[PDB]
From Swiss-Prot, chain C:
Protein name as it appears in the record: Chaperonin GroEL
Post-translational modification: Phosphorylated reversibly during heat shock.
Record note on domains: Each subunit is composed of an apical domain that binds non-folded proteins and GroES, an intermediate domain and an equatorial domain that binds ATP and is involved in inter-ring interactions. Forms a large central channel that appears to traverse the entire length of the cylinder with no obstruction. The central channel of GroEL functions as two cavities, one in each ring, that are separated from each other by the crystallographically disordered 23-amino-acid C-terminal segments of the seven subunits. The entry and exit of polypeptide seem to be restricted to the apical end of each ring.
Gene designation per UniProt: groEL
Domain of life: Bacteria
Residues of the full protein shown: 77 to 151 of 548
Signal peptide boundaries: none
Annotated residues for binding of ATP: D11, G12, T13, T14, T15
Organismal lineage: Bacteria, Pseudomonadati, Pseudomonadota, Gammaproteobacteria, Enterobacterales
Similarity comment: Belongs to the chaperonin (HSP60) family.
Location of N6-succinyllysine modifications: K41
Coiled coil: none
Record organism: Escherichia coli (strain K12)
């Protein structure tokens, strides 16, 4: 495939327009008072939305190059969200702010390598400044606090989170299920979560979480790499007959059998999903065994002479729910009995005594943890189906901002934190006057979100900006009610993780771009 | 297929552009401080990379001719790497440097044949000069030295290499496996390596090494040419049932059966690979027998009346790993027992007594060597999967540079070594004043890499160049820390093989080009 | 610049041009940095009024036939 190669300036101009269209389509929705974007949808009526994550998802441009530009910002802003639970839009809005101004500089004939330096200093400095502005959130009170604000003034959501953390810890795995009454419920239950993701996006059955949700599934616990669907066909037949879904947790599932199970849930003949097993090498076989004990399944280890051709249902583990992500598997309520699960903890307990190294220690206690520690399920209750799966939605939003708040604290939510940290480090210098420009581009990028919220509301940016700058700490403008005040007091706050991630991620791609000299792609 | 034929000048101009596009995309990534190239990728988000080998790989132009240009420089720069472990990009960067200048000469009306003569002298001269600048790397200290530098200041990698060479010799076959603990391990084990490569690139299962890696495979040791897949079908059925991969080491595998096994691992029905047997004629049958003894396999020689239709598993040899390249097969930990393996060495031992010729001698001791000498496996340990398969990667990088340093020593890494040898032979003359231009073009080419690193860093080339030239030995400029010093002491070195290969290979293709008169290709 | 340079000393017109391309290049780059051009100008002039004094200080009279030949020659 013959490529099209663009250089230096051309490449960057293309890149820049690419980035603007993403940003101009996505930024108009930022405030509590955003504007609508209309997103056409093949059959039927268009979609009107104010949700930048949805607008972004749709953005792909004709011009390759221009497109690469937009895809690159999308990429990085989505990781912001990946690591924080929010900021996707903010990240984009900021990414445009640096990229615009940094990229004009380079084009004016200033030094790229310095501009990046400058930006990266300004970011470094403001991330610190944020740590300073940041107020911790640690106690049950504070937890329910950020929870309730994050779930929109609903004090019951704040409570349920507070309560869950209170039961399985600020680590403990907490999930949400659809509720069965009008009552909320909180139950702790045998289960576990481990850091491995689906092996193919096509497993997803609920595209709004971009996640796979299997109900009452059997669990295959194979200790080997699964290559051929041949080995499978006795087990997938027993499973199809029990009319239940199935989770494969094997060393891996490769090409053939993978693309097979993929097209097997595409037409919906048997709903299935597979994920790699937790950990590697020596501590894998132990860890797989743990999930066995948890779900009362039999581990099929080729190192004792058992094929998957010799496996009936009786071998498969079983849990009342499982939910997989891009990068997480979480098994909820495992049927494996407490006679066993406790016995195993008693085994592992002892292995800690016969530990002679520290790395051999933590690794055994992360195992005792996952297993005896459990999974806390919140059932969201409500009056109507609509309410319910709306409330269920905000409960996951809050849980997200809270997990986040715990880790790094909260700050002024209206853009305000960024506006603030910027007016503090308005002496900053570098050595090159090129590095200064870099610092200033970065600094003035930091007002972008506030300026944007204001704008979207149809008030004046410059004026609200200038008055937010004039104050201190968490004084800000609350665009929803048009009052100035203490943004935190007035219930407008961002987790510290999320404002920072946003900024870091925006700065990363901007630097990347200010230092791109060449762009390869296919022929129109 | 009607062709498009271009002559002398046209030809060369097309070639020139062709090579520039390759070089200008590729060269911006050269320093420790390179710039990014964005490489679009069909579905999903683009790839940002600083890695010249990746950028090169993608370069293909629309204008055939122009494309031919770029393809020729890629060809040759990749062989540099083939023979040294590095320089792919440098070779390209120097390639452009000569081609540009020499090609201007021809066009100005000077004599091609002389310009090539000149360049080739300048190279010849500097290759020598390089041998002089070269500091040997021979003792265990020096080995760990270049290893640690080459694995990025990690003293433990230096050690492990130093230790392997120390057990199986600076020749001895040394491989790397994924580690199973947090601990690195070094084991010597019955095994062997021989100079034959995969019979089809489609066997590759790990495209980043461009290599085939089979786990616990059975080994077919056939002494004949395998043409028909008919002869195979009993053995491939026994193998498919034991759910293990299979290595064919026969005289050859041809057309039919080859394109068969190829499309048989394409859809992943049975993972298989085949490679020609080591050596030819009389000493082949002996050498094949050695691998039999090593893996406890049975050799299927048609000269005793045994078909592949009469071969069950019990005939196939077996080893714990095998890894094949473009041009190497290496068999790790063969199950063939020490009762046999030692016995075979005692047999071959005696054959050396009944040697009456010298060529009949070395050929028997290369056989005693491969067999009793064994294969040294490094297992790379680490904390997390990511770390591990990153550490594993650097261990193979260093192993490469070290093997290379051993053979020809190390020199100033920064571009420096070339900058130096060039300022030494700045009297050089030829006979034509044409050849003089040849020598100059060549010499001034030699600054290219240093100038480029500096330039990528966003410092001034001319100035760092001039000050490196003003020094001696390995004094140079370390672009990463902007300090002049002794490039080797400061840990910025290139194996001698690699700087030389880069130069020679760039000079070859430049000559080739400066002496091309015609260019044939298909119609647009 | 080149033309005035010339009506003034019949020489140095290229220098002149070279200097302007140079003030301009750099000066625009600074306008792109978001400096106020009106001030960029004032500083440029101050710089120059200063440089002219400096020159009159380095200047030594040329009045022997030898130096005269040297300016001729160089010109
Ligand atoms: Mg003059």
């Amino acid at each position: 495939a013959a490529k099209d190669v663009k250089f230096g300036n051309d490449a960057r101009v293309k890149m820049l327009r690419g980035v603007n269209v993403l940003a101009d389509a996505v930024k108009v929705t930022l405030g509590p008072k955003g504007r609508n974007v209309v997103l056409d949808k093949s059959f039927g009526a268009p979609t009107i939305t104010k949700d930048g994550v949805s607008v972004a998802r749709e953005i792909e441009l004709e011009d390759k190059f221009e497109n690469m530009g937009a895809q690159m910002v999308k990429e990085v802003a989505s990781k912001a969200n990946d690591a924080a639970g929010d900021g996707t839009t903010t990240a984009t809005v900021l990414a445009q702010a640096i990229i615009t101004e940094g990229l004009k500089a380079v084009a004016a004939g200033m030094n790229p390598m310095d501009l990046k330096r400058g930006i990266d200093k300004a970011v470094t400095a403001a991330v610190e400044e944020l740590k300073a502005l940041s107020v911790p959130c640690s106690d049950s009170k504070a937890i329910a606090q950020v929870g309730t604000i994050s779930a929109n003034s609903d004090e019951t959501v704040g409570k349920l989170i507070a309560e869950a953390m209170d039961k399985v810890g600020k680590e403990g795995v907490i999930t949400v299920e659809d509720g069965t009454g009008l009552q909320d419920e909180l139950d702790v239950v045998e289960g576990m979560q481990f850091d491995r993701g689906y092996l193919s996006p096509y497993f997803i059955n609920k595209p709004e979480t971009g996640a796979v949700e299997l109900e009452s599934p059997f669990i295959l616990l194979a200790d080997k790499k699964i290559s051929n669907i041949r080995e499978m066909l006795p087990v997938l037949e027993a499973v199809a007959k029990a009319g239940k879904p199935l989770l494969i947790i094997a060393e891996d599932v490769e090409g053939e059998a993978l693309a097979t199970l993929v097209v097997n849930t595409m037409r919906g003949i048997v709903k299935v999903a597979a994920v790699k097993a937790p950990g590697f090498g020596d501590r894998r076989k132990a860890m797989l065994q743990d999930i066995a004990t948890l779900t009362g399944g039999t581990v099929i280890s080729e190192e004792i002479g058992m094929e998957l051709e010799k496996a009936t249902l009786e071998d498969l583990g079983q849990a009342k729910r499982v939910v997989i992500n891009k990068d997480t598997t979480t098994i909820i309520d495992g049927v494996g009995e407490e006679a066993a699960i406790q016995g195993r903890v008693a085994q592992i307990r002892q292995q800690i005594e016969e530990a002679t190294s520290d790395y051999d220690r933590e690794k055994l206690q992360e195992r005792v943890a996952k297993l005896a520690g459990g999974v806390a399920v919140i059932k969201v209750g409500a009056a109507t189906e609509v309410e319910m799966k709306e409330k269920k939605a905000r409960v996951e939003d809050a849980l997200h901002a809270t997990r986040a708040a715990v880790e790094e604290g909260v700050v002024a939510g209206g853009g305000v934190a960024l506006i603030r940290v910027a007016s503090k480090l308005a002496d900053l210098r570098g050595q090159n006057e090129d590095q200064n420009v870099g610092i200033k581009v970065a600094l003035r990028a930091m007002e972008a979100p506030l300026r944007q919220i204001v704008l979207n509301c149809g008030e004046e940016p410059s004026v609200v900006a200038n008055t937010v700058k004039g104050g201190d700490g968490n004084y800000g403008y609350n665009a929803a009610t048009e009052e100035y005040g203490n943004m935190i007091d007035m219930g407008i706050l961002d987790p510290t993780k999320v404002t920072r991630s946003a900024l870091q991620y925006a700065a990363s791609v901007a630097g990347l771009m200010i230092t791109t000299e060449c762009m390869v792609t296919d022929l129109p």
